[model samples]
Target: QGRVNQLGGVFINGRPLPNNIRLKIVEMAADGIRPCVISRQLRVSHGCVSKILNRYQETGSIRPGVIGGSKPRIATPEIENRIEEYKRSSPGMFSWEIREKLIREGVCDRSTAPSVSAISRLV
Candidate 1:
C-alpha cells in the first residue's frame, strides 16, 4: 500500500487523488526533479505527473481540475412540467407515447425532447 490503512483506507475507491498530493507533486517538479522521477518517488503513474505539470504550466494554479465536467441537462423546467401533466392525465402512458406526443404538440422537436431513458426518470 500506497498510503492505505492496514484495517481499511482513507480514500474511497475510483475517486480523484487529493489536493495535498497535487501540491506536493508540483512542488517537487518546481525543484527541478525529473517528472518521471518525481512520480516514481511518489508512487504515482508518470501520466499523472505529465498532466499535472502540463496544467501547472497552462493554468498556473496549484488546484486540480474539476472532476467529471459540468452537466449539460437536456430537459427544461416547463417541458418537464408538461411531461408531468401529460403523465398524470393518463397515468398509464408509455414512454413512446409521451415522446411522440411531445413532438406532435410542438412542445419538442426530434432533437430537443427527452429520451425514453430520461423520460422514465421524469415521472
Candidate 2:
C-alpha cells in the first residue's frame, strides 16, 4: 500500500506520511536510534522503518522509488495506425490475424509482436 495517490504524498494503506518524515526517519537512524523505537515515536510501522533504513544502507537515499503506473504501451503510434488501417481494410479479420500480419510484414518480430489482447487495445 506504499502508493502515491492523487494528493501526492507517500502513503501506506491510506495513511499519508510527509517527505520530511522520511528525512527524520533517516536522521534518527543515523543517530543510532533503533528502528522499533523510531517507528514507535513516528507511529509508522516497523516494516516501513526497516525499508527506509535498508534503502539508506544500500543506496544512501531515503527516497522511495516511483510507485504506480503500468509500463508504457509497446505498440507505437505507427504500429497503431497500421493496425487501424488493417482493421478498416479487413473488417472480418480477427485481432490475431492482424498480429500475425504484423509479424509477416516485418513490422514486428514474432517474439516482439503485440499479443491479441494488446492488438485489441491498439485498435
Candidate 3:
C-alpha cells in the first residue's frame, strides 16, 4: 500500500512528512535514484517524487514547490510586490495581516476576498 503527502502541510491519510524526512528523500534523489524508489521509501506517490526530481533538474534546487502558480496575480503586480516586500520585512506576519492590508488598500472588490490561507500562499 502507498500514500501521498504534499509539502503544503497536506497529508493524504497520516501525519505530514517531517523536514528531516524530506531532506533525506531529496538527498536520495540527488544521488540519482529513481523517483519510484524514493516514493516507495517515503510511502508517497510516484508522481510526487517525479515532480521533485523534475524541479531539481530544472532549477538545480529542491525546495518545496508552491501551489497556484499565477491565479492569484489578479490583484495586479504592484500589490503583489507590496505583499512580498511586507513579507520580507516581517516574515512573522500572519497571512491575515497581508489580507487586511490588501483590503484596506482596495486591492479587490468585496465580492471575492482571498482568504488568509490563500494569502499565505502568495509566495
Candidate 4:
C-alpha cells in the first residue's frame, strides 16, 4: 500500500514516477528483457530503465536490499565432527537414525534438527 507514493521526489529530470512501476522495470530486466524495450512497454524514461538495469547487474536479484545474508550455522564444527564420530563408530546409520541417536544422546538442539536435504548438504 502507498508504494507508488514512496518514490515522491525521485525523477529522471523533472518528472516524478511511482516506485511500484520502477520495481516492475527491475522485474522485467531480471526476466532478460532489454531496458529500451521495457522503457517502451512501461512508458518510462530510458534513464529509469538504465538505473533499474544497473541495480540488477550489481545485485543478482532485482528485489531491493540484502535481506538475507550468510547461511545459518545450523550445525557447528563440533556438532559435525561429533556426527562423523557417530557415523564412523556405528556403521550403516541413516540420517534419521543418527538424528534419533543424537536426540537420545542430547547432542542436538531440539529446535534445529537437520532435514534430510540439510544432512545431504552436510555430506
Best-matching candidate per lDDT: 2
Per-model TM-score versus the true fold = 0.49, 0.48, 0.39, 0.35
Q: List the pairs of residues colliding in candidate 4.
A: none
lDDT of 2 by residue, 6-98 (tens): 435356774435678989998898898988888878767777788878988899877777777987867764788788778465777988899
Worst 10 residues of 1 by lDDT: 1-10
Query: Which residue runs does candidate 1 get wrong by more than 4 Å?
Result: 1-12, 68-105, 108-123
Error of 4 at 17 (Å): 46
Q: Give the TM-score of candidate 2.
A: 0.48
lDDT score for candidate 1 against the true structure: 0.76
Mark the regions of model 2 whose C-alpha exceeds 4 Å error after superposition. 1-16, 72-123
Query: lDDT of all predictions, in order shown?
Result: 0.76, 0.77, 0.66, 0.66
User: Looking at model 2, which ten-residue stretch has the lowest summed lDDT?
Assistant: 1-10
Over 1-123, each residue of candidate 3 has an lDDT whose tens digit, in order, gives 235345333344533345666677789976888777777777656666677667767987656655455564555546677777685648668778777777777765465677777666775
Over 4-87, each residue of candidate 4 has an lDDT whose tens digit, in order, gives: 222242444434345687678877876889888887787766776787678767875455454458767776656677677775
Candidate 3 lands at a TM-score of 0.39
lDDT against true structure, model 4: 0.66
